[PDB]
């Protein structure tokens, strides 16, 4: 543990990067029995403005939803040692910015891989906070969910027809939901 390669693989916890239109955040996320568990408490995710800030936080004794995990002692100890290397792999980069402007322009202005990752993070966040806001908004009977399902399936012909104001409104609601689930440090 520490500077060991595959450190994050072995501790089973992913550092993740989250880019909003105004900040880039760092936090930790894992899956315990297919439920997501973030670095945080009371369905609220602790976010840090740099990799060094996250490392500093992981050195101090705290009580949060990851602390009782078996490999978390490996994380804190490596944070005390100064061996902890916070690295985010490419599939753990979530970009939420710009989607609101791309939705308005219709599905063909929305990047598929970006949206795929952003939906993953959204559903993880609604899972961990035990809130159905994301799950309901993405039902395929609703404007956003229909637009999202179309963009994520290149084999789809039933194209949403303009304008897209309803999808934009539902997406703005989700952004506000996301902002309220983030605790800054
Ligand atoms: Br639509
Ligand atoms: Br609506
Ligand atoms: Br946000």
Residue numbers in the entry: 236 to 420
The authors write:
Here, we demonstrated that SatS, which we revealed is required for M. tuberculosis growth in macrophages, functions in the export of SapM and an additional subset of the proteins exported by the SecA2 pathway. Finally, we determined the structure of the C-domain of SatS (SatSC), which reveals a new fold lacking similarities to any solved chaperone structures, yet contains surface hydrophobic grooves resembling those of the SecB chaperone.
Upon inspection, the electron density map only corresponded to the last 185 amino acids (L237-E420) C-domain of the SatS sequence (SatSC). Although we set out to solve the structure of SatS in its entirety, we were only able to obtain structural information for the C-terminal half of the protein (SatSC), which arose during crystallization. The SatSC and SatSN domains are also similar in size with 41% sequence similarity at the amino acid level. This raised the possibility that SatS is comprised of two similar domains with an intervening ~60 amino acids that is predicted to be a flexible, disordered linker. Investigation of the SatSC structure revealed a large network of negatively charged amino acids surrounding two surface exposed hydrophobic grooves, which are similar in arrangement, shape and size to the hydrophobic client binding sites of a SecB monomer.
